[PDB]
Design a protein around this ligand. Structure first.
Ligand SMILES: *[C@@H]1O[C@H](CO)[C@@H](O[C@@H]2O[C@H](CO)[C@@H](O[C@@H]3O[C@H](CO)[C@@H](O)[C@H](O[C@H]4O[C@H](CO)[C@@H](O)[C@H](O)[C@@H]4O)[C@@H]3O)[C@H](O)[C@H]2NC(C)=O)[C@H](O)[C@H]1NC(C)=O
Ligand SMILES: *[C@@H]1O[C@H](CO)[C@@H](O[C@@H]2O[C@H](CO)[C@@H](O[C@@H]3O[C@H](CO)[C@@H](O)[C@H](O[C@H]4O[C@H](CO)[C@@H](O)[C@H](O)[C@@H]4O)[C@@H]3O)[C@H](O)[C@H]2NC(C)=O)[C@H](O)[C@H]1NC(C)=O
Ligand SMILES: *[C@@H]1O[C@H](CO)[C@@H](O[C@@H]2O[C@H](CO)[C@@H](O[C@@H]3O[C@H](CO)[C@@H](O)[C@H](O[C@H]4O[C@H](CO)[C@@H](O)[C@H](O)[C@@H]4O)[C@@H]3O)[C@H](O)[C@H]2NC(C)=O)[C@H](O)[C@H]1NC(C)=O
Ligand SMILES: *[C@@H]1O[C@H](CO)[C@@H](O[C@@H]2O[C@H](CO)[C@@H](O[C@@H]3O[C@H](CO)[C@@H](O)[C@H](O[C@H]4O[C@H](CO)[C@@H](O)[C@H](O)[C@@H]4O)[C@@H]3O)[C@H](O)[C@H]2NC(C)=O)[C@H](O)[C@H]1NC(C)=O
Ligand SMILES: COc1cc2c(cc1OC)C(=O)/C(=C/C1CCN(Cc3ccccc3)CC1)C2
Ligand SMILES: COc1cc2c(cc1OC)C(=O)/C(=C/C1CCN(Cc3ccccc3)CC1)C2
Ligand SMILES: *[C@@H]1O[C@H](CO[C@@H]2O[C@@H](C)[C@@H](O)[C@@H](O)[C@@H]2O)[C@@H](O)[C@H](O)[C@H]1NC(C)=O
Ligand SMILES: *[C@@H]1O[C@H](CO[C@@H]2O[C@@H](C)[C@@H](O)[C@@H](O)[C@@H]2O)[C@@H](O)[C@H](O)[C@H]1NC(C)=O
Lengths: 532, 532
């Protein structure tokens, strides 16, 4: 049967699912590791022991234990990101959508969710793979991985909580796909990994990590890059946070073994309740338990790896949304609210600046302020608001990505860069937030093709075009149809630095994406903070 | 007789001079101090001993000993600034132009020449007072003062070369005018002092200095302000330069008395030949012998005087030209030449930056570079050229003036600010230099009213208008005619910071003159250089 697939871990049975007037097969909730429970909490994942019988893969798995947003109860704009299944530490599963009839050897795309390394779920409506799998004839996988302290608590030197285990979860799922996707009709030599935000950083981290590179062919990074200032900590900062987490739960702190034992006795919600207490600064766009630069997953600093070409050389497609900062200001900074235009006073601007760049001395804060203030009109509330939005977006997403892309392109085999600046017509967040972090994802997974969801015809066309770029890139390493009459997305090269806008208008090509602001964040400010 | 005037120093006889189809009287070369020669070299000036007989004041006096520009021999653009009389240490004289018939009590305007404190002459064609005196019915005085080491050599603690004597020269001429201008028909209570560049700084310095303030009523500063980074040095830096000057001339350096004695034996040209050797940095827009912050002429630092309101409170009219930097780049920086468009390579840009801000550490140089580079187009030769022109103008003239004007306005009794951006149609310097430092002076002295000099009709009108603003300001403290139908130059206030463009087009009013760049030079960069 089409819904029966025999794999090297055992048989699995999927389910036929309707999609846009047709059908495909879905295999939901396949386990790829042993449940990381009890004394395995905080440990490297172990491969799932093979099963006899037929593994029922007709329904979505549990989501990993995580912080749940309750800021806007019942509001679809926030709740679209929250877990839509029960949470459990028993959450290492993946999902596969397969065209019908079963292909023989087709391009595979593996989705790595974002969520700041502290949240996220493979089961969200907006990550449903059926539209993309159906429309573009790809086998679409979404994996899962431990987040929060369960994924990232790091006591370097210990084997019981080494750190990075959530990244090892992702890698184990990609090993599973490498080993098994052939039985589903996928081609294991044309596996493209793709992700957004922390998921994009994660993609980058597998490009870098020697122990993951061989498992995939090429890569798409959306609004995230491995060098983002929020995406990793040093082993000392990681240890500090794990000890502070212990302090918050009245743990014995005298040794790794005492702390870990104490942390493993706690219910998952107890860790989540105090997780945000361990951050060293009052800050926005900063998460507590993130990847650690350990010497093992990452053999040296990310900057030395990037500079020396210590990474997988392949093709990458990547980009950013216009207003990356807005979500984090809404949730994290004074004077930004959901139902107000959120015009900002000089005083909320200056506070915002300090929250945005937590590691900065006063001179550094004055440099950032100068760089984004219009001194002809320094009391404009709108300008102050948009200015902070740009500070946050630039520092945390756009400029780290630009630096990644410039470094990667020197050694890699083909780079395509985009700037997504179309605000969805049915966006339920306010207008001041603009083209918000995350809101390209619906276009990439083809939601606008569904009439009920209330997108325009032009948004449908934009989504079709995005999907086809993403899938043709995954198939061939180039998002353009070799002999199309359609306008061509050119390659980003070192010299010319080209990129395209992705929106409903005819394709425009530009050069040197936010270069003015990125020289400030990537070259001048770090030099400034180093000299003081 | 009209050409005979009896003064408290003695009688003087002037000469009738033709001007624009009419005539006025001129009294040229009146002495105001004893010749500062022999053992009086470097000393405070002494008042001229009164004379019997009639002092022949029919011809211009000698110019003070100074460096003479030979870079473009015979070229009118440079030679218009060089001494047009014989040079002599016997050079403390003034010139007076008086309407005909002799007025009873009319507004007096006293011109203080520029020249970087190392050069300048009261006798230049472009400073001829006859047009202004005639057209606006003012008594026009131009004074002179010692420049170079003769005016500014400073060995603080010594009475033989205290420093600032060139400023005491100016003050002695203003004392003379205060005491005597009544005999010429001038009103000693409506004396306006005005000057350009070093002359403008000098005006500012008399506003500040307690020992000069009572001698005049109000003030005009053109492209110069007392706080300019080139216009003064500390007593330690002054001493250092006077000792280095001595080193250059194989002087005994063991005491002030040995050094000064040695320096007084030298011919004037020997000092001038090595004067530029004493500058501490490789720099542009920096002159060797300038005013010293001594505790006496200036009782405390210029910034504390400005902050505390320790200055004369009156009305001031002041402004800048659009391309103040260009002259100094031409003369001082590699890649700028007179007969080339002077497009500048990245490497000549970076060199230029370092010459422009000599006191700056590397981080400071990177800050200035960032502030003026368009990173979308960083190899444009034109942009690099114009960018350096702006750096030089901003740092040295515009931003110090903006800071002066903002500080002064808090305590003063009325401020009028202009931005002169009309390039003379007959300018003989190249186009790349734009609206060059010094080239408003011809409009202020009414040269465009003279047909032979080849200005347009619109330039004539612009000059008439400028002259009438300057003279009505001197008369009343307000450059506008109380009940004119003409457009009004508004007052610069603390809150609104208004200014006007001076050019051939209908008056436009704007606010916050180069505020973006001036926050950088006036607030951020100094903070940066202080923290390193
Ligand atoms: C991604 O990587 C692929 C695969 O590595 C890479 O394709 C390579 O491109 C180069 C062209 O730069 C090819 O090298 C040429 O091969 C031919 C015949 O095989 C030679 O005769 C060529 O030499 C001539 O031309 C040279 C100019 O580059 C001269 O230097 C020389 O003196 C000769 O006149 C030349 O070596 C190479 O074979 C391909 N390989 C394949 C399989 O296509 C591709 O360009 C990379 N893409 C990106 C965006 O980086
Ligand atoms: C696509 O667009 C359509 C067309 O606009 C849209 O349908 C609308 O959806 C909302 C669903 O929430 C409907 O609003 C409800 O209407 C009923 C009946 O009048 C009310 O009882 C509801 O009020 C309850 O809930 C409120 C808000 O949650 C509370 O504040 C209140 O106390 C009640 O508890 C509620 O207002 C609306 O009627 C339709 N509009 C039309 C014209 O049909 C659809 O949802 C969009 N589709 C998608 C997938 O987004
Ligand atoms: C330059 O300096 C001149 C001279 O010093 C200065 O002119 C002064 O302006 C003020 C107006 O601010 C005058 O003060 C007023 O005088 C009248 C009558 O003599 C008083 O009745 C006034 O009091 C009323 O209004 C006040 C509002 O300012 C209220 O505070 C008060 O309660 C009353 O209702 C007031 O004190 C002052 O007399 C003049 N002096 C002269 C000679 O004009 C001028 O404004 C300065 N110019 C600039 C640009 O700074
Ligand atoms: C106002 O504009 C008028 C009209 O253009 C202008 O008159 C011009 O002035 C210059 C004065 O230098 C004249 O040029 C000279 O002409 C004679 C005769 O043809 C030549 O012998 C001269 O050559 C000598 O000097 C040269 C440059 O200095 C040397 O390079 C050469 O070897 C010779 O030594 C010289 O070229 C020119 O003739 C007139 N033009 C006209 C049309 O009358 C006037 O000067 C302007 N007025 C002011 C005050 O600027
Ligand atoms: C409980 O404390 C915090 C919670 C949050 C933030 C900060 C917090 O404390 C400093 C924050 O910035 C937050 C930002 C939003 C990021 C974007 N997500 C939605 C999203 C998820 C995955 C990929 C794209 C968008 C909503 C929360 C949430
Ligand atoms: C001999 O050495 C130098 C000579 C000069 C400069 C620099 C020098 O060495 C560092 C300089 O900047 C110079 C600039 C110019 C300033 C503007 N003047 C004309 C002018 C004089 C008074 C008022 C306005 C303009 C011409 C020379 C001249
Ligand atoms: C496979 O699963 C289908 C849906 O299962 C649902 O969730 C699981 C955990 C059970 O609790 C089940 O009763 C729920 O309906 C079933 O409809 C289907 O019968 C199952 N098929 C087989 C062969 O087990
Ligand atoms: C006053 O001066 C006029 C111009 O003087 C000129 O320069 C002086 C220094 C003398 O050298 C003189 O011969 C030059 O002509 C004379 O024309 C005029 O005669 C003088 N008048 C009197 C009364 O001395």
């Amino acid at each position: 049967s089409e819904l029966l697939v025999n794999t090297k871990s055992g048989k699995v049975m999927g389910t036929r699912v309707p999609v846009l007037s047709s059908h495909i097969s879905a295999f939901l909730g396949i386990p790829f590791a042993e449940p990381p429970v009890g004394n395995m909490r905080f440990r490297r994942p172990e491969p799932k022991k093979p099963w006899s019988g037929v593994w029922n893969a007709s329904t979505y798995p549990n989501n990993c234990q995580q912080y749940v947003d309750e800021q806007f109860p019942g509001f679809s704009g926030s709740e679209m990101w929250n877990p839509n299944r029960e949470m459990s530490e028993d959450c290492l599963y993946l999902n596969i959508w397969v065209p019908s009839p079963r292909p023989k050897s087709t391009t595979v795309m593996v989705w790595i969710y974002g969520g700041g390394f502290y949240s996220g779920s493979s089961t969200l409506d907006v990550y449903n793979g059926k539209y993309l799998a159906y429309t573009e004839e790809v086998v679409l996988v979404s994996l899962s991985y431990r987040v929060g302290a369960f994924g990232f608590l790091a006591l370097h030197g210990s084997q019981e909580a080494p750190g990075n285990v959530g990244l090892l979860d992702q890698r184990m799922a990609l090993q599973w796909v490498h080993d098994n996707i052939q039985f589903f009709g996928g081609d294991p030599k044309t596996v493209t990994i793709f992700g957004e935000s922390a998921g994009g950083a994660s993609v980058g981290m597998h490009i870098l990590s020697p122990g993951s590179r061989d498992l995939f062919r090429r890569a798409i990074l959306q609004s995230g890059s491995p060098n983002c200032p929020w995406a990793s900590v040093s082993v000392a900062e990681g240890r500090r946070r794990a000890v502070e987490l212990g302090r918050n739960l009245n743990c014995n702190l005298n040794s790794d073994e005492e702390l870990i034992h104490c942390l493993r006795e706690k219910k998952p919600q107890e860790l989540i309740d105090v997780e945000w207490n361990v951050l060293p600064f009052d800050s926005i766009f900063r998460f507590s338990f993130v990847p650690v630069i350990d010497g093992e997953f990452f053999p040296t600093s990310l900057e030395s790896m990037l500079n020396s070409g210590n990474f997988k050389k392949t093709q990458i497609l990547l980009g950013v949304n216009k207003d990356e900062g807005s979500f984090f200001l809404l949730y994290g900074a004074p004077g930004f609210s959901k139902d107000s235009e959120s015009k900002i006073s000089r005083e909320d601007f200056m506070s915002g600046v300090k929250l945005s760049v937590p590691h900065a001395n006063d001179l550094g804060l004055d440099a950032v302020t100068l760089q984004y203030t219009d001194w002809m009109d320094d009391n404009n509330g709108i300008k102050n608001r948009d200015g902070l939005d740009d500070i946050v977006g630039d520092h945390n997403v756009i400029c780290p990505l630009m630096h990644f892309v410039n470094k990667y392109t020197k050694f890699g085999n083909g780079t395509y860069l985009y700037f997504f600046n179309h605000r969805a017509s049915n966006l339920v967040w306010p207008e001041w937030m603009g083209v918000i972090h995350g809101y390209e994802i619906e276009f990439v997974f083809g939601l606008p093709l569904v009439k009920e969801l209330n997108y325009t015809a032009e948004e449908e066309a934009l989504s079709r075009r995005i999907m086809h770029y993403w899938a043709t890139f995954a198939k061939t390493g180039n998002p353009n149809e070799p002999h199309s009459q359609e306008s061509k997305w050119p390659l980003f090269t070192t010299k010319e630095q080209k990129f395209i806008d992705l929106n409903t208008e005819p394709m425009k090509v530009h050069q040197r994406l936010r270069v003015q602001m990125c020289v400030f964040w990537n070259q001048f400010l770090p030099k400034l903070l180093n000299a003081t």
